[PDB]
Amino acid sequence: NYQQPDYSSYLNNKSGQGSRNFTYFMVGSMGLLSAAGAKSTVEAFLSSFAASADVLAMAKVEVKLGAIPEGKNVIIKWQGKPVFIRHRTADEIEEANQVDIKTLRDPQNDADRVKKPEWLIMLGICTHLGCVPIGEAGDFGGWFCPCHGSHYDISGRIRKGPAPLNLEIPEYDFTDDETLL
Amino acid sequence: MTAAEHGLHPPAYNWPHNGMFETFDHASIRRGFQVYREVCAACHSLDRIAWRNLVGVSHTTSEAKAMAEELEYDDEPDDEGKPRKRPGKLADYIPGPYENEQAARAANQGAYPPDLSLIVKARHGGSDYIFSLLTGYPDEPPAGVVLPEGSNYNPYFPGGAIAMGRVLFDDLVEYEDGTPATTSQMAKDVSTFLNWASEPEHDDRKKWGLKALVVLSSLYLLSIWVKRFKWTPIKNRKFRFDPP
Amino acid sequence: VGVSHTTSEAKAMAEELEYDDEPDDEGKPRKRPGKLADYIPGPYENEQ
Amino acid sequence: VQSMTSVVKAANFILARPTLSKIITPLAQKFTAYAGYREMGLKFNDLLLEETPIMQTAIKRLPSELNYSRNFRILTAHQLALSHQLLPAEKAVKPEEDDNYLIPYILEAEKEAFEKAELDNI
Amino acid sequence: ATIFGGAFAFQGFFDVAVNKWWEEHNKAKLWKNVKGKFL
Amino acid sequence: ADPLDTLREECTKTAACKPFDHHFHECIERVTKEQEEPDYEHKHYKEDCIEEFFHLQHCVNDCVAPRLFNRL
Amino acid sequence: MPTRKSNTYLSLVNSYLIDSPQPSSINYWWNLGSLLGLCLVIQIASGVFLAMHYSSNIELAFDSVEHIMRDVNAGWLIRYIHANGASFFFICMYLHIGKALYYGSYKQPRVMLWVIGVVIFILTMAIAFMGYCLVYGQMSHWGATVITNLLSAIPFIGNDIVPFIWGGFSVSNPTIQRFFALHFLLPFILAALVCMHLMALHVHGSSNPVGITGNIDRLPMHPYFIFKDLITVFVFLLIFSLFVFYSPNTLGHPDNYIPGNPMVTPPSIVPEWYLLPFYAILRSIPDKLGGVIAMFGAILILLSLPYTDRSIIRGNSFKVLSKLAFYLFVFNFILLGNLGQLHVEVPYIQLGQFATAYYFAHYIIVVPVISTLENILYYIGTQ
Amino acid sequence: MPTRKSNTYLSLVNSYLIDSPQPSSINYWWNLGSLLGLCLVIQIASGVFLAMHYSSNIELAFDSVEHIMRDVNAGWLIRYIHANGASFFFICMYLHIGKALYYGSYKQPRVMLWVIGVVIFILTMAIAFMGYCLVYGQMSHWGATVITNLLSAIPFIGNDIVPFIWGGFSVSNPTIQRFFALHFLLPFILAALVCMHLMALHVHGSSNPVGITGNIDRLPMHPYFIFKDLITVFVFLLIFSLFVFYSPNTLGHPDNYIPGNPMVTPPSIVPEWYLLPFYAILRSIPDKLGG
Amino acid sequence: TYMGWWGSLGSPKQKYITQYTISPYAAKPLKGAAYNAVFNTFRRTKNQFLYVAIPFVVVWSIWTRARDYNEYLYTKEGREELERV
Numbered sequence A: 001n002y003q004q005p006d007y008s009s010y011l012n013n014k015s016g017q018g019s020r021n022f023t024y025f026m027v028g029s030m031g032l033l034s035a036a037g038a039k040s041t042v043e044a045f046l047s048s049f050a051a052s053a054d055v056l057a058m059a060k061v062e063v064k065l066g067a068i069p070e071g072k073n074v075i076i077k078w079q080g081k082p083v084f085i086r087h088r089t090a091d092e093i094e095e096a097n098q099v100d101i102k103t104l105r106d107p108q109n110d111a112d113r114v115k116k117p118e119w120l121i122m123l124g125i126c127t128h129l130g131c132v133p134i135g136e137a138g139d140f141g142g143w144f145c146p147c148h149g150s151h152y153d154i155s156g157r158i159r160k161g162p163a164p165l166n167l168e169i170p171e172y173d174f175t176d177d178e179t180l181l
Numbered sequence B: 001m002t003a004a005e006h007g008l009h010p011p012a013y014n015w016p017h018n019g020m021f022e023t024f025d026h027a028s029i030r031r032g033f034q035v036y037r038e039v040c041a042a043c044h045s046l047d048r049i050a051w052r053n054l055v056g057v058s059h060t061t062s063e064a065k066a067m068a069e070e071l072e073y074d075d076e077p078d079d080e081g082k083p084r085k086r087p088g089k090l091a092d093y094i095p096g097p098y099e100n101e102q103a104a105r106a107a108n109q110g111a112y113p114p115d116l117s118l119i120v121k122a123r124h125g126g127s128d129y130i131f132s133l134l135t136g137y138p139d140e141p142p143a144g145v146v147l148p149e150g151s152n153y154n155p156y157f158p159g160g161a162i163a164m165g166r167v168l169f170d171d172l173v174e175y176e177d178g179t180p181a182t183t184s185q186m187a188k189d190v191s192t193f194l195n196w197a198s199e200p201e202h203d204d205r206k207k208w209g210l211k212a213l214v215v216l217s218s219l220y221l222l223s224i225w226v227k228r229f230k231w232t233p234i235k236n237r238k239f240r241f242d243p244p
Numbered sequence C: 001v002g003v004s005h006t007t008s009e010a011k012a013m014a015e016e017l018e019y020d021d022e023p024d025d026e027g028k029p030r031k032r033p034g035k036l037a038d039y040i041p042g043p044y045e046n047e048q
Numbered sequence D: 001v002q003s004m005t006s007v008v009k010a011a012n013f014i015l016a017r018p019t020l021s022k023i024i025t026p027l028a029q030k031f032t033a034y035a036g037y038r039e040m041g042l043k044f045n046d047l048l049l050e051e052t053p054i055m056q057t058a059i060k061r062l063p064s065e066l067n068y069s070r071n072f073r074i075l076t077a078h079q080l081a082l083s084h085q086l087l088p089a090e091k092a093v094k095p096e097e098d099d100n101y102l103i104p105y106i107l108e109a110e111k112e113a114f115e116k117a118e119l120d121n122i
Numbered sequence E: 001a002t003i004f005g006g007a008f009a010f011q012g013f014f015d016v017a018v019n020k021w022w023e024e025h026n027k028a029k030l031w032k033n034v035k036g037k038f039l
Numbered sequence F: 001a002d003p004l005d006t007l008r009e010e011c012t013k014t015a016a017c018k019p020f021d022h023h024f025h026e027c028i029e030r031v032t033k034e035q036e037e038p039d040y041e042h043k044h045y046k047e048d049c050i051e052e053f054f055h056l057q058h059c060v061n062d063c064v065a066p067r068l069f070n071r072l
Numbered sequence G: 001m002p003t004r005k006s007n008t009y010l011s012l013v014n015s016y017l018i019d020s021p022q023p024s025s026i027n028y029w030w031n032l033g034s035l036l037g038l039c040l041v042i043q044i045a046s047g048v049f050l051a052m053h054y055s056s057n058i059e060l061a062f063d064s065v066e067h068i069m070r071d072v073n074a075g076w077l078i079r080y081i082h083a084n085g086a087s088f089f090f091i092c093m094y095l096h097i098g099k100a101l102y103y104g105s106y107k108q109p110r111v112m113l114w115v116i117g118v119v120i121f122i123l124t125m126a127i128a129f130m131g132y133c134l135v136y137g138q139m140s141h142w143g144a145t146v147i148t149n150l151l152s153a154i155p156f157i158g159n160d161i162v163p164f165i166w167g168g169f170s171v172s173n174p175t176i177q178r179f180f181a182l183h184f185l186l187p188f189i190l191a192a193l194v195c196m197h198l199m200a201l202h203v204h205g206s207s208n209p210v211g212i213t214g215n216i217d218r219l220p221m222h223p224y225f226i227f228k229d230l231i232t233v234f235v236f237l238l239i240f241s242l243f244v245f246y247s248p249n250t251l252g253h254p255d256n257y258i259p260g261n262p263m264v265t266p267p268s269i270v271p272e273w274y275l276l277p278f279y280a281i282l283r284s285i286p287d288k289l290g291g292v293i294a295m296f297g298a299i300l301i302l303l304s305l306p307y308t309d310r311s312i313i314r315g316n317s318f319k320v321l322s323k324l325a326f327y328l329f330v331f332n333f334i335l336l337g338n339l340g341q342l343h344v345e346v347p348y349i350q351l352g353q354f355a356t357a358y359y360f361a362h363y364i365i366v367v368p369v370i371s372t373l374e375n376i377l378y379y380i381g382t383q
Numbered sequence H: 001m002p003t004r005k006s007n008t009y010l011s012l013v014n015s016y017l018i019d020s021p022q023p024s025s026i027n028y029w030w031n032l033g034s035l036l037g038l039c040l041v042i043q044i045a046s047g048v049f050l051a052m053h054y055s056s057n058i059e060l061a062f063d064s065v066e067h068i069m070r071d072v073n074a075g076w077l078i079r080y081i082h083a084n085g086a087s088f089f090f091i092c093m094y095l096h097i098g099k100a101l102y103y104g105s106y107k108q109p110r111v112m113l114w115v116i117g118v119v120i121f122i123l124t125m126a127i128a129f130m131g132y133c134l135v136y137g138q139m140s141h142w143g144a145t146v147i148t149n150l151l152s153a154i155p156f157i158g159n160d161i162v163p164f165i166w167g168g169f170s171v172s173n174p175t176i177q178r179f180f181a182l183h184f185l186l187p188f189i190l191a192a193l194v195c196m197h198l199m200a201l202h203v204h205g206s207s208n209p210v211g212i213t214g215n216i217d218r219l220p221m222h223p224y225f226i227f228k229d230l231i232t233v234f235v236f237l238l239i240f241s242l243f244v245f246y247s248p249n250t251l252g253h254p255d256n257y258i259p260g261n262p263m264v265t266p267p268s269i270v271p272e273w274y275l276l277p278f279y280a281i282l283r284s285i286p287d288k289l290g291g
Numbered sequence I: 001t002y003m004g005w006w007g008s009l010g011s012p013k014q015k016y017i018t019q020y021t022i023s024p025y026a027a028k029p030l031k032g033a034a035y036n037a038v039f040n041t042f043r044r045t046k047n048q049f050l051y052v053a054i055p056f057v058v059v060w061s062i063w064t065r066a067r068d069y070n071e072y073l074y075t076k077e078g079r080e081e082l083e084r085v
């Protein structure tokens, strides 16, 4: 139709696939570098949601242990959740001696739920809709979940109610008249 | 203001941690912490630094916990309700020498030695200033200047009169690593330690900054190339206007 | 004041009690007679 | 915005007086040379603020050839500003070609608008 | 998608490169290298 | 001896710092003379050498700053 | 039609981002708009992550900020982002006003846009200032006190408005709490004003560095001016990282790290740098009421600008004298900003008075006189 | 053209309020939307005036609320509004969903609209719940605790997401502070969602009680359905006053006025009334993840 | 309005103008970026320098005189002149 301007100089020296491949590589590299930067920024921000150093330091705090009446259930505030530190007498140990492989959502024994009967540690938070169980209303003789009436055994096992598991035992270690979390 | 009120401008010492890619000389942080406990703690609070902050920075967790033990801290009253005291633990904040501002002012002729946990970010010269403040005391004040009783002359202090008076003297502290304890060296250690206490994120901050510069610079170069490439069609347009 | 007691009565009831003030400049604890702005005090220092 | 009629009134007020003419006109040519619009292919009347009803009417009443020439000059100016380059001196719009082609239509539009305003307040 | 997967690759590459260059540029200053002199 | 004192001594001896040091000592002498006159405590403007001291200290700091920490 | 046009929300996104017919000759200055939006996101995003840890009580504000700095995992990063990002927000906004002043972006077709611009500016200043008051450092508290005391200069309502502003008898807990609430809020009102800004832009489109109509040659936005916006955004973030990670406190004032103490005033009271110019104007006028009126005029006169600019040609790019006038005005503005942080002293009081005089004279004399003179010079030159 | 159409801002206001061609046969139920919008304002308005006095610290949240009630001039009014107005916000939202379920307002031409509706619903619930947690009463605290414990049931991420929510190891100061921040915020996200709702409504218009097309007979909105909106608004405000001024705590739970104490769980845990149905569903399924 | 959508942007009837271009993949990217960014940038700076220099020179001269006078006032020899002001 008419003469076009000469692009001779403007032309690339690459082949059809080479130039397209390089352009797509550069665009993809930009996209993935942006993805990496956005991931770094978003992870750094979301790490703010995580427990600050203050909260981490406050947790794993030892409890002032010592002599207490046998069978009495003490209370603590380790990591917010109440801790039902109770020095169940030899009667509780004897009762727990009766094993139970059936009629128990999670059959267990004081062998693993406690280190020594002279000091029994168990978080008071319940299983279903975690609540603080009553220290004497348990149908099984231990703690009772007031919200659903669930009964917690003297060994912490879930006897009856909506309990999804057994009464959690914190990771607290024992020592000479001290609690070592 | 006259030069004196603004305070002599501290110079720029080539700190080990000045450049964009250098950390605190954690040896210097520990040495400055020793200088602090040995000299400053008599007057200055430095409350915002918890013993846990020193684990992995200048003291092993065992050393920090041990240091925390010697001190006593308020505890929730006993079962009867009487006051109780407990040995310090890592989570506890370093305690100042004075219970409140009133006690500090009473014990320092009314001057209130400010908390040092932010003194580096709360002064114009930053670390330099602190160093210049500690080693700026001249043996003989410049002639003609009369200081209020109890005040000491230091040109780097705004107004020229500072109540602190020289504290760092040669061989005042026996450093753990056998480092000589010249007053200049001690000022350097305390300045570095206070700068850390004021900027504990400094090391991680600058490492993250290096990562960010690398990523954003590569991405910016990629963006330049992509834009120039994709605009070549427009920047290479050629027109013709051929009416009758 | 204006609900069940005239301001004078409330003020007088305030002086009848003791409250903790900012400790004296010597650092010793100090106490002051109550004033209107003060909250009514409970009979126990804490839940314990 | 200053109505073009007022601009021409001021321009003839200055031009009529030989002293003001001899002073300004050299500065006028120098200012239009330093303005830098001519090196981009634009005549003066291309720069005029188009987004006004009077100006829009004036453009709408241009002859076809002037309209197409204006379109091409504006397009060339846009391309030059886009590529960050200027026309060579031989291709730039010479002072003689900066011919004030659009002013007559703008003045006619201004006259119509002013007559309408005057009669509306008769 | 594969964008999220490649984010791991790029972030990890830059992260390891920087952590390895930084602890080499500052090895004389880091606590993990200085704690021995104070032990 | 601490490196800072010896660096200060070296720098004040430098030719660049010499004029400021000379001015500072002359000012010290003049201020002492002013203090000698018995009506000194009546004078409204009691001269002081803070400015000369500041100039000397700035000129000395510009020298010590870069070199100080190489000694520590 | 394509999904990007049939769907309503994608249709809006297309109208504003993918197919918006930008002129082809726009410089990088036109990218500043995008940056501002990005900054508006950052200020919000990081901002929301500071309210998750900031405690607005007066006895906890500064300590809460320090808790963010030292205790929260990335708290130092979020705080530095939120502060230096406000500073960069104002840098980009000043550049976006300077561009709109240099090119006649404020002229006939876009006056409404310009007006919204000014409002945004006004609003932003408040936000920024209010945010500063939240740190409750020395400079924070005393800046709040000075602003309230000056606002107490209203003829009759002044004595009654200030206690409402304080919520008490001096800058105290109610003041800081209400500043926190209004500071969290007003950014979203500003987002609404930004959407209004974008609609007022879309109705008539954006201007050109040449000023002439762009309709003859326009380009889509998705292939073009999106990857230009990416260049500008990455340059912005690169400099923002140079600041945030290295020397983050350069723009801030050291005294702000001293917890606020009403009983001891700091040696000098200065806003954050971006408010210094207006502050200077405020101190140039002796009367407090006159000072406040002149301060607010220093912003609101931008509204008068589109009518005082009597130029038939949009923009400065092709105007000699107008470019000298604009650069003189910009440098006087920087001089006012500099005087903002300097003490009231012998030469500086007179220099600030002259600087304010010329700052207003620009708008009310120089722009009209220069524009008219240049119109006449243009017409005489072509004939 | 008229100023109400030439100006873009007034053009939008006209398209949505003054000339929106509403069908002529819409009942009073179609007014609920306006009320919801009104309530969104009220929730925000009173809300912005509570944060000016609310202190989000866990040791100050409840005392700060009581300071609002007792010390702030109209603080009792602002709190009772912000609370009973949330209850009424959900009353009107349930009525707006019931209307959309009875009349087929969710059917073909408006499916998109319906979707935003649902999202709004979801988002709103969060906001409301989160705001309730700010009071930090017994029921407030234990509702937060139960919610987070249930969300702890996600298969693998559950054990890790909860600390990110709690900001710690249990509902504590970080949890209340983040709830306050996100609660101040999410209402504006909800305002944006409401704008999207209105856009999806304007694209295809509103339905009819008869269901058939309204295009045959449509009425403007300024003289019609704005004055119907006023009847509905004034009835809403009259009932809202009967609640706010008389028996304002009827909808709330008394236990929420006991400051939160983790060491004593109250006799029963119930959400605020409008979330009770879903809560019931949650308890109907035994498995926590199932629930 | 003064800018429609793509179909009708408000441009006058445009005719007789032919626009040529080549594919980006067929064109050399960053051809003379090295030479252009130096020579053309210097040309642009040369053209626009005076407009930024004359105002800058004036303002910075005023600032320098003011700053120098202020420095002079707060000195032992500037005491009397400071007092007179």
Ligand code: HEC
Binding pocket: B035, B036, B039, B040, B041, B042, B043, B044, B108, B111, B112, B113, B114, B119, B130, B133, B157, B158, B161, B162, B163, B164, B167, B190
């Ligand atoms: C005893 C008294 C001490 C000791 C042992 C230390 N500090 Fe000081 N210091 C002290 C007071 C009462 C004051 C207030 C002076 C005033 O005029 O307000 C100060 C001052 C400081 C400052 C502030 C300087 C300034 O704001 O310009 C700093 C910084 C400072 N002191 C540092 C510091 C260091 C590093 C110490 C190490 C042992 C130290 N002080 C000890 C009182 C006393």
Ligand code: HEM
Binding pocket: G029, G030, G031, G032, G033, G034, G036, G037, G038, G040, G093, G096, G097, G100, G103, G104, G105, G106, G110, G113, G114, G116, G117, G118, G119, G120, G121, G194, G197, G198, G201, G205, G206, G207, G208, G302
């Ligand atoms: C958050 C703050 C702001 C945002 C997000 C914003 C948004 C935008 C956008 C997207 C553009 C188009 C791109 C461009 O022209 O650069 C633009 C241009 C513009 N900006 Fe803003 N703006 C903001 C603040 C302001 C302010 C405070 C002013 C003036 C006081 C202003 C004045 C303008 C004007 C007049 C234009 C039109 C430019 C032209 O057409 O030449 N803007 N803005």
Ligand code: HEM
Binding pocket: G040, G043, G044, G045, G046, G047, G048, G049, G050, G051, G054, G065, G079, G082, G083, G086, G087, G089, G124, G127, G128, G130, G131, G132, G134, G135, G183, G184, G187, G188, G190, G252
């Ligand atoms: C354009 C919008 C905004 C601007 C320009 C802005 C600017 C600022 C500035 C300059 C500060 C001073 C902080 C400092 O110097 O340390 C500040 C503080 C603050 N801002 Fe913003 N802000 C904006 C929006 C927001 C939003 C949406 C939030 C939401 C939470 C927010 C939350 C805060 C908080 C909590 C502080 C306290 C500062 C601190 O604790 O360090 N801001 N803001």
Ligand code: HEM
Binding pocket: H040, H043, H044, H045, H046, H047, H048, H049, H050, H051, H054, H064, H065, H079, H082, H083, H086, H087, H089, H124, H127, H128, H131, H132, H133, H134, H135, H183, H184, H187, H188, H190
């Ligand atoms: C649709 C949006 C919103 C809904 C449905 C809503 C609902 C609620 C509800 C039910 C409460 C419980 C208060 C109580 O039981 O005492 C609450 C608390 C609260 N809300 Fe809102 N809210 C909304 C938006 C907002 C906004 C925008 C703010 C802005 C500040 C806000 C601020 C607050 C505050 C500060 C509280 C604490 C309650 C108190 O201190 O008494 N809310 N909200």
Ligand code: HEM
Binding pocket: H029, H030, H031, H032, H033, H034, H036, H037, H038, H040, H093, H096, H097, H100, H103, H104, H105, H106, H110, H113, H114, H116, H117, H118, H119, H120, H121, H194, H197, H198, H201, H205, H206, H207, H208
């Ligand atoms: C703040 C909350 C809301 C506001 C302000 C709002 C706004 C509106 C408005 C103004 C109308 C027109 C009047 C009417 O038809 O009643 C409307 C109708 C509608 N509402 Fe909403 N809406 C909200 C929440 C919801 C929610 C949560 C849903 C469903 C889950 C929903 C579903 C609908 C539907 C489907 C329509 C169309 C009704 C029809 O055309 O027959 N809306 N909405």
Ligand code: FES
Binding pocket: A126, A127, A128, A129, A130, A131, A145, A146, A147, A148, A149, A150, A162, A163
């Ligand atoms: S209380 Fe809900 S199941 Fe244990």
